[PDB]
Structure formats: C-alpha cells, structure tokens
Design a protein around this motif. Structure first.
Motif, PDB file in Angstrom:
ATOM      1  N   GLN A   1      21.594  -7.159  30.943  1.00 12.16           N
ATOM      2  CA  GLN A   1      22.575  -6.160  31.378  1.00 12.16           C
ATOM      3  C   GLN A   1      23.256  -5.474  30.196  1.00 12.16           C
ATOM      4  O   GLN A   1      23.709  -4.331  30.318  1.00 12.16           O
ATOM      5  N   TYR A   2      23.345  -6.144  29.046  1.00 12.20           N
ATOM      6  CA  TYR A   2      24.030  -5.545  27.905  1.00 12.20           C
ATOM      7  C   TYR A   2      23.204  -4.415  27.298  1.00 12.20           C
ATOM      8  O   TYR A   2      23.637  -3.258  27.267  1.00 12.20           O
ATOM      9  N   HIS A   3      22.011  -4.733  26.811  1.00 17.89           N
ATOM     10  CA  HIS A   3      21.168  -3.745  26.160  1.00 17.89           C
ATOM     11  C   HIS A   3      20.398  -2.925  27.189  1.00 17.89           C
ATOM     12  O   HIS A   3      20.005  -3.417  28.249  1.00 17.89           O
ATOM     13  N   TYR A   4      20.124  -1.666  26.849  1.00 16.50           N
ATOM     14  CA  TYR A   4      19.381  -0.778  27.778  1.00 16.50           C
ATOM     15  C   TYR A   4      17.879  -1.016  27.628  1.00 16.50           C
ATOM     16  O   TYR A   4      17.162  -0.940  28.635  1.00 16.50           O
TER      17      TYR A   4
ATOM     18  N   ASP B   1      10.976  -1.138  26.517  1.00  8.10           N
ATOM     19  CA  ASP B   1      11.172  -0.649  27.874  1.00  8.10           C
ATOM     20  C   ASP B   1      12.440  -1.249  28.463  1.00  8.10           C
ATOM     21  O   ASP B   1      12.955  -2.261  27.984  1.00  8.10           O
ATOM     22  N   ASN B   2      12.935  -0.602  29.517  1.00  8.85           N
ATOM     23  CA  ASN B   2      14.109  -1.082  30.238  1.00  8.85           C
ATOM     24  C   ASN B   2      13.711  -2.265  31.112  1.00  8.85           C
ATOM     25  O   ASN B   2      12.821  -2.148  31.960  1.00  8.85           O
ATOM     26  N   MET B   3      14.372  -3.404  30.911  1.00 12.98           N
ATOM     27  CA  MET B   3      13.970  -4.641  31.569  1.00 12.98           C
ATOM     28  C   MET B   3      14.372  -4.709  33.035  1.00 12.98           C
ATOM     29  O   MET B   3      13.812  -5.528  33.770  1.00 12.98           O
ATOM     30  N   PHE B   4      15.316  -3.883  33.484  1.00 16.16           N
ATOM     31  CA  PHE B   4      15.794  -3.958  34.858  1.00 16.16           C
ATOM     32  C   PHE B   4      14.990  -3.118  35.839  1.00 16.16           C
ATOM     33  O   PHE B   4      15.079  -3.357  37.048  1.00 16.16           O
TER      34      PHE B   4
ATOM     35  N   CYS C   1      10.103 -14.245  20.762  1.00 17.71           N
ATOM     36  CA  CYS C   1      10.237 -13.053  19.932  1.00 17.71           C
ATOM     37  C   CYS C   1      10.927 -11.916  20.674  1.00 17.71           C
ATOM     38  O   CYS C   1      10.470 -10.770  20.627  1.00 17.71           O
ATOM     39  N   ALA C   2      12.022 -12.221  21.364  1.00 18.71           N
ATOM     40  CA  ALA C   2      12.771 -11.201  22.080  1.00 18.71           C
ATOM     41  C   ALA C   2      13.591 -10.363  21.110  1.00 18.71           C
ATOM     42  O   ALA C   2      14.147 -10.880  20.136  1.00 18.71           O
ATOM     43  N   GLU C   3      13.660  -9.062  21.377  1.00 18.14           N
ATOM     44  CA  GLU C   3      14.455  -8.153  20.566  1.00 18.14           C
ATOM     45  C   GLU C   3      14.844  -6.947  21.407  1.00 18.14           C
ATOM     46  O   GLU C   3      14.101  -6.526  22.296  1.00 18.14           O
ATOM     47  N   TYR C   4      16.023  -6.400  21.116  1.00 20.58           N
ATOM     48  CA  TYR C   4      16.567  -5.296  21.898  1.00 20.58           C
ATOM     49  C   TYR C   4      16.966  -4.130  21.005  1.00 20.58           C
ATOM     50  O   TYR C   4      16.741  -4.162  19.790  1.00 20.58           O
TER      51      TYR C   4
END
Lengths: 239, 214, 116, 239
Positions: free
Chosen positions: D76-79, D192-195, D230-233
């Motif tokens: 929810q924080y990062h787009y 990409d947008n995760m939501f 390896c998650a990154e935003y």
C-alpha cells in the motif's frame, strides 16, 4: 552564506556560520541492540508565536516526537530504546524587533505541582507536539494536578537565571536569530522505556520581552526542528 | 535438424487477417481495422502458445475494384488510386472520407494506384513496454493491458466519383517479423468464444474411445 | 526445549511463537506467525529448542521477582491438525524443558520464599 | 536429515535432500530502485484440508501476501514494485494415505468467467490469504461474475494435463510430501503496480484423489509457505 542540510527525505536551510552548542562535549553515539536510520529525518514541529506577554514554552523530548512517523512507530513497537538529539530553534524577525531568548535543554526536568501534596498529570507535564507554556503568574494551590508554571522558578523550584548551567544558547534578536543544541544520550541506565520517561526537556524562555513599534508584525514565529541521532532499540528475535 | 520448428519459421507467415469493402459515393466509404492479433483464431492460437512476444509488422494490401450499376450512357473511369493510412496509437482518427485526419503528417500513408504491385508497409515494435502480452492477469476492465495497442489502418478512394460508383475490397496480409517469444503456455483447448477475453465453455480433455484397453 | 511424545506415525505442524516484553500475546495463528516464531514439524523432528533473548531495560541484571511489568510470552498454535494412520492414537502429549542458555548470573543472595 | 532455514524472525524445517525446482533456470535478482530486506521472512498461510472430494486450490501471488506484515505495508505504501518468490508446499500424511498432487506456478494466469460476456470480479479471482477452490462440476452460465472453475480446463480453457509446461513439481504421497518452486520475476515491464496485477498464480490440483482406509485421518493438511525474494520498490524522495 546559507547551508542546506538534507536528512532522509527532509531538508532545511541554516546560516552557514551559525554556532552549534554541543551538550556536554559529547556527540551522540551508539551503545558501545537494533538501530534505525529511517528515523534520521528532521521533524519540524508547529511554530509558536512569540508575543509581548509570552512567558515561555517547553517540550518534553521523547513525547514531542511520539506522533511523528517511524520514530513514534518505533516508540510503540519497541519496549526499550535510546537516542540523542539535534535541536534547531529559529526565529523569523525583522531588524525592527527586539528581544532575547534563552534556549536550554534540561536533562531530567522533573517539575513540581501546584498542589503541594500531589504530582502533575501527564497531560499537564507534556502536550506531545503541542508546546506547554510557562506563566508569569503563580498557579493557585486549589488546582489539584497542574504544573507550577511560574517562570522565575522554571517549574523546578530553582532560579531561572541559573538555567545556563544546562546546555543552552542565547538568541538576541539584534545579533542572532537561530540556536543549535546537540544533546547526547544522558541516563542512569543504558536503555530505557521511551513512553514512561522523558529524558530531556527543551525550554525557551524570553528574558527580555519582545518589543516593536506600531506597524511592525505583532508576533515573531519560533520554529523548532528536532532530528534524532544514533537511535537504537531492543531486538525482537530469538537467539 | 528442426529448423522449421523455430519460433521464426513458426510465426513468420503471411496471413489474411481482415477483409472489408468501401464504395466511393457514400461519405462513409472508408474501411478501418484496429490492428490486433485476435482477429483470426488460427493465428491467435499460434501466438498464445507464449505469454510475451516481440515482433515487427509487415503488412501487404491486396486491393481490387468492381464496377457498380450506373445509368450513365457511357462509363470510362480512369485508373483508381487508393490511400492507406496508418494511425499510430494516440493519433487522430477519421470519421468521413473528407476529414482532416486523412491529411495528418504524422499519420504515415501510402498512395497506391491500381495495376501495380500491391503496396506494402512495415511497422516496428511500438509499445512503451518491453514486449507485447498475450495474457494479462490484472486490471487497467480485467485483462486488457492497453500497452498492446498497435494502431489502426484506414483505407479510402483518392479519386473523385465519376459517372458510376466503384466498390473496392481490401485484403490485409499480416506477417510478424523477427519474433521473440517467452514463457510457453499450454495450447488453447476450448473453442474461442469472444475476441476480447479468454472466456470459454468447458469441454472434454480429448476425444473418447470405448474402453481403456484397445 | 519441547519434546513431542506421540506415536512415530503421527504427523503435524506446530507454531511456536515468542512475544517480546511489551508486545501483547497473539490472539490468532496469523498474529503469531507475523511475529517471531518457528514452525515445528513433529513428523520430521521430535524436539525443538528455543533460546529466548535477555532484552532488559539496559539494566544488565533485573529483579527475580517483579510487579505488573512487561513479561514476554511463549505460545504454541496448531498450524495443522495431527494426522494419524489407522490404529494409532491421535491424542498425544508434549514435554517442556527449561534451562539457562547464555551467560546467566545472579546477585544479592536472599532467603528462598518456599520455606515456611 | 532435517535442514532448518531461518529468514528474519521466522524459521521452518525442510527435509535436507528435498529437490528444489527453479522456475526457468533463473534465480530472483535485483533490477540490473529501493529494496526492502525486512520483507525477507517466511509467510506461512493458513493450511488447507485435502479431502477425497477436493478438486484443487489456487492463490494469486501479490494478493496472497497483501495482508502480511511489512510486505502488505510496502504494497500500500509504494505505487510500484517487483519481486521474486520461493514457495514451499508441504503435506502432512502417513504412509497409509495415497494420492498425487500437481504443484504448479502459472505466470499471468488469466481466468475466464462463467458468463461468456462478462469478466470475473476481484473477489472471485482472488481471496488474498484465503485459498480459491476449483470445482469438479461446471459453473452455470446464469451466474454473472464467477470464475469457470472446472478443474479439467484449469479455468484457462486449456488441458489440465498440459500444465506441466509451467514450473511445477509432483507430490506423490508414497514417494515425497513436499515441493519447492523458486519463481523469478516475470513481466513485460521492469516494475508494475502490485495491487492491480497478479504476476503469478500458484495452483495445487489433485490428479490422483486422496484415498485411505477407515480409521485413518480423513484429511491431509497442505501448508503453503511463501518467502519474497529480492523485493524492491520505487523511490519516494527528490533528486
């Protein structure tokens, strides 16, 4: 010359040749368990309005930043923690304004109560981000749980003119308008619970009242900016 | 060897994807086709063996005309010239034969006259993304992925109408070039139901015999 | 240390969660999992050993007795049910063992409260 | 032999000699803007009960971890964001139980709708941490916005026996009981947008139904453990 300082996602500007007062000759350092560096951002509190009848303002340190971003989040998350501070105080006044301020950081500023038999309540001892104001009058004894806020005793039963023993900086409007106090971690224990103990209290007391002629702005804003330094908390994992 | 089973030899084949007609006396006598690979089931199934694709476009147009009934004593129409305009994604689009969109300089157009070799134009990979997607599990409407827009094609007569109407038909030939494919997927088993979505009606896994043993 | 004392044919998963002092006890398997935890598979291991951390008010030594103070909890949850074959009892038992792990120390000898 | 793997403040145990299936021969890596390592913890979802009449279960990846700790918080924080996954599937069954499972991770598993003219709603396409179940019957067309969950088409209008083209592992109860699939980041765009987009869909389909004799446990729990890799935003600061 103007120097711009950026911390995290926040940036402020200070006069390049401003004098910084180090608390006791000791810079904030880490405990010789878990540190946090996303907390290292300037927190600009709400500005207060210095007026002719202003008696003073104070903010308890841990509490003032209890509702600010991750620092407050870390405060409710972790049970124990320790940190230093860097406090910026800035006044916006013209050369047609006169006045002198004392900007002092008092460690363990335990305050008395108007009723001699009781102790002040948490609300009266701290307003979080909101500032607590001293009073040029004496709070009556009838009142049960309020702080004795007479300025000349500084709420501690001492001579207000002797507060200079604690790390401090004078703001004389004709000479300077900003103060910078670097406060290390000072406690009798290496780490402490941040919600039940206020290690530091920042005080701003006008020794010479603000004066101006008709037409000038009838107020002088005072802005407090606090940046936690070398913050670290207790671990939450197994061994 | 298996050179004929490579991706290039599997997908690099011309195919008639669209067919339309337009007359020259209607104000609406223009043909349009939004470029999409879901028009033909055979090509759609071959492209849907993969998830992500990257290719260039080669288009060949086969235009033929036919004389329409008239009352003129004598009809002697000259050779007909046709305009084929490619509208890139986001470009202006016509609504009449006489429209400004036909004269947009950023809309590349081919002027071709009958009797010669059929006209041919090539469009490169024009997506802001790094590849086209044949499948999208998300929302922009579920599974649209507007990053697959490839433009639109428009066709009209250039000559003015003479003493008799002329009806023309255009056959668009579609050929992916320099194709790259990723993430193989199971071949489509149920019959395609809609061009816009993957909706299907459940069918059997295979054809049936009498018993497990011969 | 927790020892599973069921049959050798019983299988299942247990979630052993440690709540640091101050933080409340978990109310669900999800809340326990989101905190510090270990998934214990009795089908693979019969014993699991956890060394809970010191974590005290930078006091080095803390009082043996206490008064309404942040305590810290350990809890266990059914990640899965106990899977058992035919003719094997599903009801089992677990034994817990305690001991000092890291550099343990005491101070200020006193009288034990257990004698009259 | 048993191998214990600890990630962050969570630890799980796996058979030392378990076989791991790498998705497409590519391990999760960083984009050659802002990474997060506190997300690197095992997320054990709620276990499902494999029964005789079970048709299958599926979980959309980004969505399954949308209500789990900092990973959901980051969602929810990062787009924008991107990440790989490591999926552990474990069954608790005795030697008196028989059955075979297909454990497959399908990239961009776009699903059809029971009504041919509409598309499935978000609720029916994903239940977050809750699992979505396939159906051994065919969903009627009257229904307007539900997924056509007939197992033999896998909700994609394909032969279910052909799902082995996508990274997969078989769980044959008489031979093995666990599966480990390492899935890299697969998309047509770097981030990409995760939501609004589910990159991956994990499917568990029983090809051979669970069978047992009277007296044995009438169920076999299946536990899914997912560890983002390896998650990154996207960054949130100025330049």
């Amino acid at each position: 010359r103007v120097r711009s300082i950026t911390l995290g996602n926040s940036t402020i500007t200070t006069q390049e040749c401003a004098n910084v007062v180090v608390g006791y000759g000791v810079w904030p350092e880490y405990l010789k368990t878990q540190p946090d560096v996303a907390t290292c951002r300037f927190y600009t509190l709400e500005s207060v309005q210095w007026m002719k009848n202003s008696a003073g303002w104070w903010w308890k340190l841990p509490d003032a930043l209890s509702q600010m971003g991750l620092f407050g989040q870390n405060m409710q998350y972790h049970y124990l923690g320790r940190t230093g501070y860097t406090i910026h105080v800035q006044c916006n006044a013209s050369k047609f304004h006169q006045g002198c301020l004392l900007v002092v950081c008092v460690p363990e500023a335990e305050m008395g109560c108007s009723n001699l038999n009781n102790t002040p309540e948490f609300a009266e001892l701290s307003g979080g981000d909101t500032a607590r104001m001293f009073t040029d009058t004496q709070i009556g004894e009838t009142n049960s749980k309020k702080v004795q806020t007479a300025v000349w005793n500084a709420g501690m039963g001492v001579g207000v003119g002797n507060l200079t023993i604690y790390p401090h900086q004078w703001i004389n409007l004709r000479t300077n308008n900003s103060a910078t106090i670097v406060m290390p971690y000072i406690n009798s224990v290496p780490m402490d619970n941040m919600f039940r103990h206020n290690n530091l209290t920042l005080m701003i007391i006008p020794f010479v009242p603000l004066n101006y002629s008709e037409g000038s702005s009838p107020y002088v804003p005072i802005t407090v900016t606090i940046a936690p330094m070398c913050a670290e908390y207790n671990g939450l994992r197994l061994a | 060897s298996r050179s004929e089973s490579s991706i290039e030899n599997f997908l690099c084949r011309a195919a008639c994807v669209y067919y339309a007609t337009y007359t020259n006396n209607s104000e609406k006598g223009y043909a349009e086709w939004v470029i999409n690979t879901r028009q033909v089931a055979q090509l759609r199934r071959k492209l849907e063996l993969f998830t992500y694709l990257r290719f260039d476009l080669e288009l060949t147009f086969v235009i033929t005309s036919a004389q329409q009934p008239s009352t003129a004593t004598s009809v002697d129409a000259p050779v007909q010239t046709h305009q084929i305009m490619y509208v890139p994604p986001g470009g202006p689009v016509p609504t009449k034969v006489t429209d400004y969109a036909w004269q947009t300089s950023t809309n590349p157009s081919v002027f071709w006259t009958e009797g010669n070799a059929p006209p041919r134009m090539s469009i490169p990979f024009i997506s802001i993304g790094n590849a086209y997607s044949c499948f999208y599990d998300g929302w922009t409407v579920y599974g649209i992925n507007t990053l697959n827009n490839m433009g639109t094609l428009y066709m009209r007569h250039v000559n003015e109408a003479g003493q008799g109407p002329i009806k023309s038909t255009v056959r668009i030939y579609f050929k992916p070039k320099h194709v790259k494919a990723w993430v193989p997927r199971p071949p489509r088993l149920c019959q395609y139901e809609k061009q816009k979505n993957v909706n299907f009606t459940p069918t059997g896994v295979t054809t049936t015999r009498v018993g497990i043993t011969t | 240390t927790f020892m599973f004392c069921g049959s050798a044919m019983a299988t299942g998963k247990f979630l052993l969660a440690y709540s640091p002092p101050g933080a409340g006890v978990p109310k669900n398997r999800k809340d326990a999992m989101l905190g510090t935890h270990v998934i214990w598979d009795v089908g693979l291991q019969s014993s699991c050993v956890l060394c809970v951390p010191w974590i005290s008010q930078t006091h080095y030594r803390y009082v043996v007795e206490d008064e309404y103070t942040a305590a810290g909890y350990i809890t266990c949850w059914y990640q899965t049910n106990i899977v058992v074959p035919a003719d094997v009892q599903s009801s089992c038992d677990i034994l817990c063992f305690v001991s000092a792990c890291n550099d343990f120390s005491v101070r200020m000898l006193k009288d034990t409260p257990f004698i009259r």
